[PDB]
C-alpha cells in the first residue's frame, strides 16, 4: 500500500516522485494528492510541478481550508482560535445573503469563482495557496470557493497535512473531488516529518488564557445559570483554579507528566462534588457554547464559541487517551494541561487506506520510521549517488558534555573551537545551537562579526539577514529547531552541540513509551530523531552531485551516530582538517 524513497537532496525530490509515481497516476482513475507541512515546502514542490508542466500534461491546484483561504472572516471578526466547522456555517450564511440579493454581504462571492480568467490562473500559472490568496484579494474573488470550484477538474492537488488529516474536512474535500480514498494516491512530501505531524495534529491542550477567553464570552452572552446556583462564569472559575492549583503544586522548573484522572480529582476535592456533577456541568457548558454559536450566527458573526471549544477539549482530556497519549501539565503561557500524543500510528493510519508514497531523502534506517509511523511498506534508496569525498562530516571531543546545560569552562572550549574553525575556513557558515541560552552564552564569549537569529522571527527580518547571507560575508547563528531550517550559499555547518530533544515531560514520556514497547526508548525517542535532524542539515548543505560542503559536530557523544551516518569521521583539530578538506575540494 506504500513505498518509501530516498533521494539525495534538492531540486529533484518531487520530479522523481511523479517519475516514480506515474505508476498508477491516471490509468486507474487515480488522483495525485500532495501533502506538505510548511508553506515554504509547498512552493518548492509547486516550482517543480511548474517546471515539468511544459514536459507533459498536468492539471494541478493548491487546496487549503477556509481557516487559511477565507478572506472575509478576518475583517468581520478576529478571534484567537477558530475552526473549519464555524467558518462553514459562517460562510454558507454569507453565500445565502449574496444569493438572496445582498452582494455586499460577502464581496468575494460572485461569478469570478467559476470564470475562465480565474481558472486559467490556477492551472496555467499554478500558484501557491498564499499566492492564490493574493490573487483573490486584489481581484475581489474568494480563493477558497475558487479552489473548490476548480477542484473537480483537477488531476493533481497540493494541500497541507493538517488539511487532509482532519477527518471531517477530508470527507467534504473528497465528496467534491468525486474521488474516494480507494481512488486516490498520496505523495507525502518530506515524509521524515510524518511522525511529528501525527503527534502534533493528534495533541490538544486546555490553556488558562483559553479559559480567560471563554470567561469574557460568558459575560457577553448572559452568563446564565448552568446549575441552579452555578453560572457559566462560576464553572469557568472552577476549571481555571483546578489548572492553576495543579501548575502551582505539581511542577517546578518546567513541564511535568500527570495522570488524566488527576484534573477531575483536583476538580472534585476543591469544589466538593463527584464526577456525575462535574461531567454534567461540563456538558451544560458545551450546550451554552452551542447557544453562543447560534446567537453569533443569527447576527452575521463567525459562530465560534470559546466555551464550546473549551467544553469539548476538557471532556476529551478527562475521557480517553490513557495508553497512546500523555497528560502534561505546563507553567508556560499562564499554564495549560495537554494531551500529548506519543504514538501517531493511529492518526496516520487513515493514509494507508489510500496508496501512499513516502518521499524524504533523510530517513536512513527505515525500521524506526516503519515502527514509529506504523507503516509496513517497502523501502528503496532511489537516487543517483553523490561521491562521499565531496562531503565532509566529522565530530569533535574537546567540548565534553558531562552536563547538557552547564559548565562555563567547557563553554569556553565551545567558543574557541568555533572561532578557530570560522576564522580559518573563511566560508559561508551557519552555526546551529541546541538552544537560545547556549547560543547567547557563546555569542558573548565569541568575538567575530556574525549574524544572530533570536526569537521573534517575523518573515520580513528573516529575509533581511538571508539577503546579506547569500550576498556577502559568511557566518550566521541559529537554534537548530528554528525557522532557518526552511533554507549555492551554504558551505559549512557547525552543530555547536548535538541537537538533542529537550528534557521535556513529553520527550520523557516518549522514552518510556518506546522503552515499554521496544526496550529501546533511547534509540527511538532520542537518537533516531536526532540523526534525522542532522542528516537534514547535511542534506540541505549538499543538494547537487557537484556541490561541496562540510559539517562538524562539537560533541563527545556524537560517536553514536556513525551507524546512522556511515561516512562521518572524527577530528581533534577540526579547523585544520576542514581547511585541508576545502583545499582538496577546490582542486576540482
Ligand atoms: S465566499 Fe466569502 S465567506 Fe466564503 S470563504 Fe470566501 S471570503 Fe469567506
Ligand atoms: Ca456546534
Numbering used by the authors: 23 to 509, 515 to 615
Paper quotes:
The XPD and XPB proteins are two helicases that are present in TFIIH, and which open the DNA around the lesion in an ATP-dependent fashion. We solved the crystal structure of the XPD protein from Thermoplasma acidophilum, which shares high sequence identity to its eukaryotic homologs, and show that it contains two RecA-like helicase domains.
The current model contains residues 23–507 and 515–615 (586 out of 602 residues) of the XPD construct with residues 20 to 22, 508 to 514, and 616 to 620 presumably being disordered. The first three domains together with α-helix 22 from domain 4 form a donut-shaped structure containing a hole with a diameter of approximately 13 Å. Domains 1 and 4 represent the “classical” RecA-like fold that is present in all helicases of superfamilies 1 and 2 (SF1 and SF2). The interface between domains 1 and 4 forms the composite ATP binding site. Domain 2 displays an exclusively α-helical architecture consisting of six α-helices and one 310 helix that surround the central 4Fe4S cluster. The FeS cluster is coordinated by four cysteines, consistent with the coordination typically observed in 4Fe4S clusters, and all four cysteines display continuous connectivity in the electron density maps. Using the first RecA domain (domain 1) as a reference point for superposition with either Hel308 or NS3, XPD assumes a more open state that is mainly mediated via a rotation of the second RecA domain (domain 4) of about 30° or 16°, respectively, relative to domain 1. The postulated DNA route passes by another highly conserved surface feature in XPD, a narrow pocket that is formed by the strictly conserved Arg88 and Tyr166 on one side and Tyr185 on the other side, and is located in the wall of the central hole, directly adjacent to the 4Fe4S cluster.
